[PDB]
Design a protein around this ligand. Structure first.
Ligand SMILES: CCCCCCCCCCCCC[C@@H]1[C@@H](C(=O)O)[C@@]1(CCCCCCCCCCCC)CCC(=O)O
Ligand SMILES: CCCCCC[C@@]12[C@@H](CCCC)[C@@]1(CCCCCCCCCC(=O)O)[C@@H]2CCCCCCCC(=O)O
Ligand SMILES: CCCCCCCCCCCCCCCC(=O)O
Ligand SMILES: CCCCCCCCCCCCCCCC(=O)O
Ligand SMILES: CCCCCCCCCCCCCCCC(=O)O
Ligand SMILES: CCCCCCCCCCCCCCCC(=O)O
Ligand SMILES: CCCCCCCCCCCCCCCC(=O)O
Ligand SMILES: CCCCCCCCCCCCCCCC(=O)O
Ligand SMILES: CCCCCCCCCCCCCCCC(=O)O
Ligand SMILES: CCCCCCCCCCCCCCCC(=O)O
Ligand SMILES: CCCCCCCCCCCCCCCC(=O)O
Ligand SMILES: CCCCCCCCCCCCCCCC(=O)O
Ligand SMILES: CCCCCCCCCCCCCCCC(=O)O
Ligand SMILES: CCCCCCCCCCCCCCCC(=O)O
Ligand SMILES: [Ca+2]
Ligand SMILES: [Ca+2]
Ligand SMILES: [Ca+2]
Ligand SMILES: [Ca+2]
Ligand SMILES: [Ca+2]
Lengths: 646, 646
């Protein structure tokens, strides 16, 4: 547990292992900080000062981002019957005086966050870096629209807030490289997609003109490209070609041939491209990540080789491993570390250490050990640190804790009003579970809240139990059953302890890693909806009124989806989700073609679909196939290389 | 172009290249024929006699298979108002006298086809190989049903006909190995799938008991596992959780979390397993194919090495290459073939040829050359054989022929009754197209009807044109309209020729390969429907009547799907197709739960789904990802490897 304020004493001995820390967890530092400048030079202090306020910044980034539900409609005041809810949302819309407060607080942190790299980049460099120049200008745009409501065309604030939220996060920008690096391949294949629509849209207009079909549905040619596009999605499958089938039965041979080519041949081949084009772009990000590693190791190799000859004595590099605080006794480990990499140079047995050799060294060590084990810095003035047989024992606990609920809920079909003997069993079970995590700080380590992936995900849920049980009878109702389903992620911990089964073993570790790995790649799509909603709120604001007469003819009134409606922002975010899932997405396309009365409404849903069935095929479906083959072959090699490494 | 009747002269010199032919196109021969027995022993004659009647057999296998639409309903005669059509099909159902004519002729070929391996396998061997023991017994079951004609429980004929059709074809059996070799992995993951239905079905029953939701939809717990299964398919997405959403808006955060786990995380991970389990089973079929190759080369290496020492002089193997009819200037490249394929042994420069070395020889030759070029052998007594500048030229030919069609159809929106100057342009264009294939027999070769993949697919449509134009004015109406509509495979010939474009190069080189590669793997699924139809015809025969009162309440009458009906066989095959595509598949599950009045109807559609979303994820979607990476890397390698392949 060495220091982190460590590139500021900055010895050749000392400042190495901070750089060696920077390879293992792999955080970047700026190329301005990578070239020169130290914590003695009062710039690298501000680098680690930035990472102190990181949780301050991400608290702001979602604070800015979640304003978009809470801000009002595009047209509250032009609209009549404004305060009523004619199928509007739930949220309170913030008043204009309240609107200012939540933004001025928001902007001032951005003005810190955007101009904090002045403290460790030069102003003639900071304004040159051409990534900030986007982000700086986005701040100015909010600074305008705050001033407009301070002074009190269509208020283009919320599009920018997304773009601020996309770029600021390191993960979403790293996602966003994989779009623009690959988007030349997707729009490429979008043509040959559109070709086998237009050709196959045409033949149905050719074949079915004089029959009942062209009389009924396929009136225009443009009626077909409209319809046959929906059948490319197959979310309207038999309703299209009933009167083609009802007239002649042999007309089915067309449509069942079309969808086969449509779904089963093309849409997979769209996925075949995008998953294949993913691999090249992912390789460019990985190699772009690994060039960061060697370029940071070049600063590390130059920090030691002060003779500047490119060869370092071994005792010069052995001695820093205790300062590395990696392993405890070091008599002959580095002699073993020669054969662990491919070849020994052995021109001198110890004296010659080449540039690429040490770059292989620090990269190798953290894989085998994971022994750095660094906790957070504590004050010793309190000193609060208190100084599968058990696995099969805790296999039994979450069994009987689970069946306690199903007994409680088969009491609820009996509807016991006398829960007095059953409330004896209620409060006791939450008191139990805090004891099975207790041996871990007795056996191995204290700060493993951030270590086990279960403690990454259950740590709220582990501690939320008895604090919910506390205000049960001391509050002397709706929040009472709020716990009564919350006491069920016990099975989710029972999942992982059942997930030691070797029969499920590859499928286990993917779905574990599937939550952290696909958090940016689903995070970007959540930002994409925040674009499409804020378009559609402004396009379709007060459109579905209370008494709109074009409404009740259409499909939203037939199937009674007279909710989601786009009539403000959080109503829109649900509505784009159904268009994401493709559950009956042609209702809205059929509805807003009538509620706007125009065919330029069809633009909004197709432009969703193309970018969606890029992004669903891009980052959902192509990752899982990459993520499984990561988790599969490790299990396939851990037995085989465990025969080697032992 | 030597003979094929060639292992019956059966020289050590001669009968080699017939075995060398058997490696190149790779047909199997039986292990009885592989062990011993020759065309002198007459058994090898019956082997090639079998492959003469191959097209006779596949003409029978679809003849037997297509009786199942043409055979009648399960209950014509118990049903009242039998001859009327109350949402029944189109086909004429075969009369019982005319039925047996189509069956006795069918069976007599099977009795040839099943007992033809008597002629080249011993009877104590033929009844031992346990493929036949299935297949012979299936013949007996049909032989029963012909006796049932003279008598005039539920007539289980048509299930067997599929099983006969599956096993007889070599491709579908090779598909069917990949099921049973992998089905232990799929049902393995089906349980862990079923768990994250049940648990996620459970919480929605837990959450929504006291609210409006459990009052309205989620009445039973079994009501939820019913509903939440449909939302795993998302073919009923907002209709489920409207009254959960209409009451509390926060209930959406459940459902949008469920489908993400449901579709985007699980269903890909089901596809991740099945595509990964595909690779191992496909490797077993490939290695099972390649063991056939070396074991056939062992008979070839033993045919030459008559000294039985395992080493063959090169002039013994040089001399047969002219009998192979492979290449013209032989002795200059046979020394280069030492250097091209692999490394030379060079203990003797030519004298020593090992067992595995010759196995490397004949394997590599057919790749580089393709110079065997075997035609269909003619009688010379008639002697009917008559003894990209052009590519950019025939690029232009279809274009002006294509725009002639769209001019003809924009005449039809004008509706010209005077087609007399326009019929000058009609008949002339079909006469043109037979001339662009004509240089191929002048430049390169005659029998390339089976060689170019375009001539594999266009050859019916290439020649159908002028014979459709012939009976236009000499018949002095509805049929010649469709021929006017048929004038469109020209752009389908443009599809192949245009993808010399490197921008689209890999994509349709897949799609070319995609039709023959996925012909068995879609063929099996077509057989799977012929199982599920013949179940559902017998289960649901006269159910959707004319005046059924339970019918008009349900969804098939609401959305007017009163076709797609199950009330005979070909209504079923359309109907299972919609359940295959997943276009509104919950209508039938909602309908036949009412029209049978029972909950055991739900079995039929779920058991469809699990086997289907095996087989769609199995053999559609896993192939295209395998097939693209076959087509992609060959384009990626040949540009670099052609500098080495030279
Ligand atoms: C893939 C997405 C990962 C990111 C997770 C989303 C974080 C943002 C959370 C949104 C919370 C809004 C809840 C709204 C209810 C409330 O109680 O306030 C409410 C809005 C309905 C649900 C909103 C979620 C829609 C977007 C999620 C799905 C898209 C992501 C792909 C109604 C307001 C009320 O009356 O209380
Ligand atoms: C992949 C999967 C498959 C599915 C199947 C379905 C269908 C298709 C085929 C495609 C290719 C493979 C089919 C065929 C055809 C159709 C049609 C139907 C109708 C009937 C009508 C009759 C009269 O005429 O009336 C299948 C379905 C069925 C079959 C049938 C055949 C024949 C027909 C006619 O006849 O038309
Ligand atoms: C593969 C391309 C085939 C056809 C694609 C081009 C067709 C473009 C427009 C077709 C004509 C529309 C017919 C009605 C228009 C009108 O009468 O004004
Ligand atoms: C990418 C291919 C298609 C994308 C979107 C499909 C929209 C094409 C359908 C045409 C709209 C209706 C035709 C206009 C006829 C009219 O206005 O009278
Ligand atoms: C962004 C590019 C996509 C282009 C969108 C579709 C291109 C063609 C538009 C379809 C209109 C054809 C309708 C003509 C027939 C008619 O109006 O009567
Ligand atoms: C984050 C980049 C945004 C991408 C495109 C945003 C702006 C495109 C269209 C904006 C408003 C379009 C609506 C026009 C019709 C109307 O306002 O009534
Ligand atoms: C990929 C971008 C999607 C392309 C959107 C297609 C737009 C076509 C809209 C209908 C076409 C007919 C235009 C006439 C407009 C009108 O009738 O008012
Ligand atoms: C994240 C980038 C997405 C931007 C692309 C979506 C914008 C395309 C169309 C938006 C609405 C256009 C149709 C509105 C017509 C109208 O004004 O009535
Ligand atoms: C992960 C599992 C959670 C629960 C799964 C087991 C539930 C099986 C049946 C639940 C009880 C059904 C309630 C009504 C039955 C009745 O009273 O007849
Ligand atoms: C593979 C998981 C589910 C598969 C099929 C889902 C069927 C479960 C739904 C239960 C049916 C209705 C409940 C019975 C109650 C009753 O008899 O009224
Ligand atoms: C082939 C195995 C699949 C098993 C099919 C589903 C297993 C459970 C069946 C659901 C019935 C539960 C309904 C109980 C509640 C009630 O009826 O009141
Ligand atoms: C090819 C193998 C067939 C697989 C299973 C076939 C037989 C299973 C069920 C057959 C009939 C089931 C219908 C029972 C109810 C009824 O006949 O009324
Ligand atoms: C994988 C196989 C599919 C499993 C099929 C689930 C069958 C459940 C059917 C409903 C369960 C309730 C049984 C009561 C029958 C009845 O109400 O008549
Ligand atoms: C190719 C193999 C598929 C066989 C599996 C399908 C058979 C499962 C259920 C068939 C029908 C069962 C439900 C009928 C109930 C009834 O008799 O009313
Ligand atoms: Ca040195
Ligand atoms: Ca050494
Ligand atoms: Ca309806
Ligand atoms: Ca020899
Ligand atoms: Ca030699």
């Amino acid at each position: 547990s060495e220091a982190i304020t460590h590139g500021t004493p900055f010895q050749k001995a000392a400042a190495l292992v901070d750089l060696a820390e920077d390879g293992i967890g792999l955080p970047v530092e700026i190329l301005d900080q990578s070239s020169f400048g130290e914590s003695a030079r009062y710039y690298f202090i501000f680098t680690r000062l930035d990472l102190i306020w990181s949780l301050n910044y991400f608290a702001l980034l979602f604070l800015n981002f979640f304003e978009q539900p809470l801000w009002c409609e595009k047209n509250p005041k032009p609209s009549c019957k404004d305060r009523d809810y004619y199928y509007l949302g739930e949220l309170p819309y913030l008043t204009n005086a309240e609107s200012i407060i939540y933004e001025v607080i928001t902007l001032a942190i951005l003005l810190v966050h955007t101009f904090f790299p002045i403290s460790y980049e030069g102003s003639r460099i900071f304004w040159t870096s051409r990534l900030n120049l986007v982000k700086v200008a986005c701040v100015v745009i909010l600074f305008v629209d705050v001033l407009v409501d301070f002074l009190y065309p269509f208020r283009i604030a919320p599009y920018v807030r997304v773009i601020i939220f996309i770029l600021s996060i390191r993960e979403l920008r790293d996602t966003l490289v994989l779009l623009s690096g690959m988007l030349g391949t997707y729009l490429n294949i979008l043509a040959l997609w559109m070709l086998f629509l237009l050709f196959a849209s045409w033949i149905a207009f050719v074949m079915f003109e004089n029959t009942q079909q062209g009389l009924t549905v396929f009136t225009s040619y443009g009626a077909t490209l409209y319809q046959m596009f929906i059948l490319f999605t197959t979310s309207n499958n038999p309703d299209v070609w009933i009167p083609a089938y009802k007239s002649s039965r042999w007309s089915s041979v067309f449509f069942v041939l079309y969808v086969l080519i449509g779904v089963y041949f093309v849409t997979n081949l769209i996925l075949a491209v995008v998953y294949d084009s993913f691999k090249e772009q992912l390789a460019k990000q990985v190699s772009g990540m690994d060039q960061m590693k060697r370029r940071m190791l070049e600063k590390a190799f130059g920090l030691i080789d002060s003779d500047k000859n490119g060869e370092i004595d071994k005792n010069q590099c052995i001695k820093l491993f205790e300062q590395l605080t990696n392993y405890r006794t070091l008599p002959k480990i580095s002699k073993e570390e020669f054969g662990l990499i491919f070849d020994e140079l052995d021109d001198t047995r110890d004296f010659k250490i080449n540039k690429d050799e040490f770059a292989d060294l620090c990269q190798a060590i953290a894989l085998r050990f994971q022994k750095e084990e660094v906790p957070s810095l504590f004050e010793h003035f309190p000193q609060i640190y208190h100084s599968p047989n058990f696995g099969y024992a805790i296999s039994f606990i979450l069994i009987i804790n689970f069946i306690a609920v199903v007994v409680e809920t088969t009491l609820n079909i009996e509807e016991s009003s006398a829960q007095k003997p059953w409330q004896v069993a209620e409060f006791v079970f939450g008191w139990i579970y805090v004891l099975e995590m207790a041996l871990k700080i007795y056996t191995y380590g204290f700060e493993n809240y951030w270590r086990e992936g279960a403690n990454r995900f259950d740590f709220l849920v582990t501690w939320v139990i008895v604090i919910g049980e506390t205000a049960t009878f001391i509050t002397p109702f709706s929040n009472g059953q709020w716990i009564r389903y919350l006491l069920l992620a016990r099975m989710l911990r029972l999942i992982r302890l059942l997930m030691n089964v070797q029969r499920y073993r590859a499928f286990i570790a993917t779905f574990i890693t599937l939550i952290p790995s696909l958090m940016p790649y689903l995070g970007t799509i959540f930002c994409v909806l925040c674009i499409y909603c804020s378009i559609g709120v402004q396009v379709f604001g007060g459109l579905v009124n209370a008494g709109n007469k074009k409404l009740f003819e259409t499909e939203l009134a037939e199937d009674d989806y007279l909710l989601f409606n786009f009539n403000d922002y959080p109503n829109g975010m649900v509505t784009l989700f159904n268009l994401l899932v493709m559950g009956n997405w042609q209702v809205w396309m059929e509805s807003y073609k009538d509620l706007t009365g125009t065919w330029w409404s069809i633009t909004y849903f197709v432009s969703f679909y193309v970018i969606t069935i890029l992004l669903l095929l891009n980052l959902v479906v192509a990752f899982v196939l990459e993520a499984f083959f990561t988790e599969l072959d490790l299990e396939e090699e851990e037995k085989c290389q465990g025969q080697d490494s032992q």
